[PDB]
Amino acid sequence: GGDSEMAVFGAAAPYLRKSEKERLEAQTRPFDLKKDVFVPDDKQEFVKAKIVSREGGKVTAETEYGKTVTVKEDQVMQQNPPKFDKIEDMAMLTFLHEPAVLYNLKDRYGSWMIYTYSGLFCVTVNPYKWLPVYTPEVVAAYRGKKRSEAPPHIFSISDNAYQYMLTDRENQSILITGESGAGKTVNTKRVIQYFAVIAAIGDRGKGTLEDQIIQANPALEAFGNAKTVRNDNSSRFGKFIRIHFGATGKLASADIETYLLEKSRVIFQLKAERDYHIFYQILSNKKPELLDMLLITNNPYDYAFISQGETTVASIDDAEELMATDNAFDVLGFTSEEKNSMYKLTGAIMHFGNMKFKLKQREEQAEPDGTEEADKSAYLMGLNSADLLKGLCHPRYVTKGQNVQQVIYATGALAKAVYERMFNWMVTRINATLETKQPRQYFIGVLDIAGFEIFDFNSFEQLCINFTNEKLQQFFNHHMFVLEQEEYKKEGIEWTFIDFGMDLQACIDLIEKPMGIMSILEEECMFPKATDMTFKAKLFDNHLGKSANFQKPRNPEAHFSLIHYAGIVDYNIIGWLQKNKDPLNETVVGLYQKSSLKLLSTLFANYAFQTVSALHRENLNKLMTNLRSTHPHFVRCIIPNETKSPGVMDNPLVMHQLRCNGVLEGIRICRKGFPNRILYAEKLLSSLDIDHNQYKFGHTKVFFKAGLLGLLEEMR
Ligand SMILES: Nc1ncnc2c1ncn2[C@@H]1O[C@H](COP(=O)(O)OP(=O)(O)NP(=O)(O)O)[C@@H](O)[C@H]1O
Ligand SMILES: [Mn+2]
């Protein structure tokens, strides 16, 4: 029958492509081109409306949601015909404005169809519901197929990447970005799982490389993931996995790079948030020997660093995860000594935050107020209690005093530093397991980081990640430019414009260049006299006249605006110097270096310097060099709502993501050329009062400037 092309997907079909019956019925639905449109809306960005009247200047209409609106004609936007309902590749739409895109994804999502292409982009909308589309039957059905030969699916990106690698003898890249809760990690896991399922086996820790690559997740997640408002299993670090292959797709090796762990979370949680999972995994009591080994109770509320917000989360069984974490470490080849050391240090951070301090009666100086929790920290860290507390009270050379606030601050900074270093070391250790003697030719790199971030409060962390997405969006634009070029060249159309990647340089230069934002930040970090306001003066003095992308802040207090590709972002500048330098109590670091616990010693052997900014620049450069040696593939994750509600879509929220993630950006840059291209000659066009500069003739197709087809199918 008409659906025979879908038969191989079995029960997954209703979630991949709607049947031919539904297709032809949708096509007969009542549709007047002139009446059925999109207009702007206050509460819900855009809304499908039916035109009731014209003014001669304005238009009034009947809103979906049952309202009457009066708008300027300029604001009215045409709907795509029923022919285009739930289209699989949105580049094939006649009208490619904001509403057209939003509604095509909304109609797919309403129908439980989670995957859509938009030129190069695979777009994924979080279902918040398990769908039967990740079965062996679906895997079998994607093997060796081209994009156009199967409905949209994350499996298509995976299989094609693997196939491109073998066919073109070339590194591949899968960039999976989006907001917190969008689905980045779910899709990342599917992609890795897919390679492990299909990759060839190469010549002969525990089990197989496939086992080990996958078991890397439960290990990182315990220490790097946490409950946030947005996401029960939020990744609080960016991740880049290169899976290496040999000649015929033999799984050869893998390596993991992690970026910008959230040190703050170690010691602080907002009302509705938790610390990293591991703390609650250990406290679940599932492994009773750990409470005794860590000198700890089962009550998170006994521990100040980890109980400032939430403690439990219904979706997570912390006890089962502890066994998941521990198993992972076993599979990954970690020794008892190595596992116990990380548990000990986790426990030590727990006790560290319970050290209380008081003022000397006749002095403005801090002393310990009880020392039991200090004793437990020192024993676990292989340190001397007295030395530790001496160090914290009287940092040493010349000897400085400390009030309680200073010691409490120093305590928190040290705990964060220890946690961060442990996480890095763990990643380094997993890399040792994943290293093999097997021969490599190519890799496929999978990137899982948060996309572009515009919050109510934007600080240093936001600048860093927004800087990354600028380079990633440029990377996309450049790739898009090369493809559009090959295409105009192949079909024989002389086209001219500057590299699409260049459109992002001015912003990047402002951030990246010598005497740019990062450089000014790092130069100020050299001066002990420098302050937040001296830093803010220095940026302004260098840029407010000179760099168009640097502006006054629009009126939570912000200090300057950056014009990014994704919009104008206001930045708060308080604390950037400290964030960047991360000064520690050197006397206590000296003790860490001399610890009887091998791990602690290791974590501080190589110690200041390198600022957060310069480390970020070093990592981003490495990333970009890898990605540039690569055929890239682009996966855009979208979160549909704030309430975890399956099949429900908030329009302004999806619209915000589309503006920030490249989907609208890609549409915009293709608009510079001739986006609509249809296969068949020149006499018919020359026989119309139509604007003659709006079209060009190619070998296979005729190329149209956007809006010609709009006026062509209209006349039809
Ligand atoms: N394809 C899917 N099917 C079913 N549930 C999903 C899917 N994608 C995401 N989810 C749900 O959404 C949650 C969060 O997705 P996840 O991949 O962790 O988001 P993320 O983009 O990594 N956000 P973050 O890591 O915080 O930046 C998951 O735990 C699932 O419950
Ligand atoms: Mn994640």
Of the candidates 104, 160, 234, 411, the residue annotated as catalytic is: 234
Residues 358 and 356: their CA atoms lie apart, in Å, by 7
Ligand index nearest the alpha carbon of residue 228:
1
Is residue 202 part of an annotated ligand binding site?
no
Residues facing residue 697 across a β-bridge: 702
Is residue 180 part of an annotated ligand binding site?
yes
Method used experimentally: X-ray
The verdict on whether 1 is a catalytic residue reads no
Token pair for 418: 């220890």
Of the candidates 124, 187, 188, 231, the residue annotated as catalytic is: 231
Is residue 181 part of an annotated ligand binding site?
yes
DSSP state of 88: S
User: Ligand 1 pocket check: which of 114, 177, 231 to mutate, most ligand atoms within 8 Å of Cβ?
Assistant: 231
| Among candidate residues 361, 166, 136, the one with its CA nearest the CA of residue 247 | 166
The verdict on whether 341 is a catalytic residue reads no
| Among candidate residues 101, 128, 99, 98, the one with its CA nearest the CA of residue 116 | 101
Residues 178 and 635: their CA atoms lie apart, in Å, by 9
Ligand 1 closest atom vs CA 185:
17
Residues facing residue 259 across a β-bridge: 238
How would you label 316-339 residue by residue, b for 16+ Cβ within 10 Å and e otherwise? bebeebbebbbebbebbbbeeebb
Mapping DSSP to helix (H, G, I), strand (E, B) and coil, where does residue 252 land?
Answer: strand
The answer to whether 58 and 64 are in contact (CB under 8 A) is no
User: Ligand 1 pocket check: which of 155, 227, 233 to mutate, most ligand atoms within 8 Å of Cβ?
Assistant: 233
How would you label 93-113 residue by residue, b for 16+ Cβ within 10 Å and e otherwise? bbbbbbbbbbbbbbbbbebbb
Residues facing residue 366 across a β-bridge: 359
Residue type at 636? R
Sheet (strand 550-551) strand order: 550-551, 560-564, 567-571
The verdict on whether 181 is a catalytic residue reads yes
> What is the extent of the structural domain holding 693?
676-715
Is residue 184 part of an annotated ligand binding site?
yes
Of the candidates 238, 412, 451, 673, the residue annotated as catalytic is: 451
Residues 299 and 691: their CA atoms lie apart, in Å, by 75
Residues 8 and 138: their CA atoms lie apart, in Å, by 8
| Among candidate residues 246, 300, 294, the one with its CA nearest the CA of residue 276 | 300
Residues 674 and 283: their CA atoms lie apart, in Å, by 60
Question: How distant, in Å, are the alpha carbons of 179, 306, 402, 447, 695 from that of 227?
Answer: 15, 12, 34, 22, 53
Pocket of ligand 1 (CB under 6 A): 126-130, 178, 180-186, 231-235, 450, 637
226 alpha carbon to ligand 2 midpoint, in Å? 10
222 alpha carbon to ligand 2 midpoint, in Å? 12
Q: What are phi and psi of 330, to 5 degrees?
A: -65, -50
Question: How distant, in Å, are the alpha carbons of 82, 361, 461 from that of 576?
Answer: 53, 35, 9
The verdict on whether 234 is a catalytic residue reads yes
The verdict on whether 180 is a catalytic residue reads yes
Question: How distant, in Å, are the alpha carbons of 121, 442, 447, 581, 714 from that of 168?
Answer: 21, 10, 21, 45, 43
DSSP state of 508: H
Residues 67 and 59: their CA atoms lie apart, in Å, by 14
Question: How distant, in Å, are the alpha carbons of 188, 213, 392 from that of 166?
Answer: 21, 21, 58
Ligand 1 closest atom vs CA 114:
1
176 alpha carbon to ligand 1 midpoint, in Å? 12
First to last CA, the chain: 32
* Residue 374: burial class (beta carbons within 10 Å; 0-12, 13-18, 19+): buried
Residues 512 and 535: their CA atoms lie apart, in Å, by 17
Nearest residue (CA) to ligand 1, atom 1? 126
Ligand 1 closest atom vs CA 128:
5
Ligand 1 closest atom vs CA 637:
21
Domain holding 702: CATH number?
1.20.58.60
186 alpha carbon to ligand 1 midpoint, in Å? 5
Residues 265 and 310: their CA atoms lie apart, in Å, by 12
Is residue 185 part of an annotated ligand binding site?
yes
Q: Where are the beta strands (DSSP E) in 307-453?
A: 357-359, 366-368, 442-448
The answer to whether 357 and 406 are in contact (CB under 8 A) is no
Residues 277 and 224: their CA atoms lie apart, in Å, by 8
| Among candidate residues 89, 86, 163, the one with its CA nearest the CA of residue 123 | 89
| Among candidate residues 340, 330, 327, 321, the one with its CA nearest the CA of residue 279 | 321
Residue type at 246? G
User: Ligand 1 pocket check: which of 15, 129, 185 to mutate, most ligand atoms within 8 Å of Cβ?
Assistant: 185
Query: Tokens 């003095």 appear where?
Result: 541
Of the candidates 160, 185, 469, 572, the residue annotated as catalytic is: 185
Nearest residue (CA) to ligand 1, atom 9? 183
How many angstroms is the resolution? 2.6
153 alpha carbon to ligand 1 midpoint, in Å? 16
Is residue 1 part of an annotated ligand binding site?
no
Question: How distant, in Å, are the alpha carbons of 40, 54, 452, 504, 657 from that of 567?
Answer: 19, 33, 10, 12, 11
Residues 549 and 242: their CA atoms lie apart, in Å, by 34
> Between β-strands 442-448 and 115-118, what pairing exists: parallel, antiparallel or unpaired?
unpaired
Residues 222 and 342: their CA atoms lie apart, in Å, by 12
The verdict on whether 451 is a catalytic residue reads yes
Return the ∠ at Cα 549 (arms to 544 and 554), rounded to 5°: 75
* Secondary structure in 3-state letters for 595-627: CCCHHHHHHHHCCCCCCHHHHHHHHHHHHHHHH
Of the candidates 19, 111, 180, 601, the residue annotated as catalytic is: 180
Residues 509 and 519: their CA atoms lie apart, in Å, by 11
Residues 161 and 142: their CA atoms lie apart, in Å, by 12
Token pair for 617: 């620049």
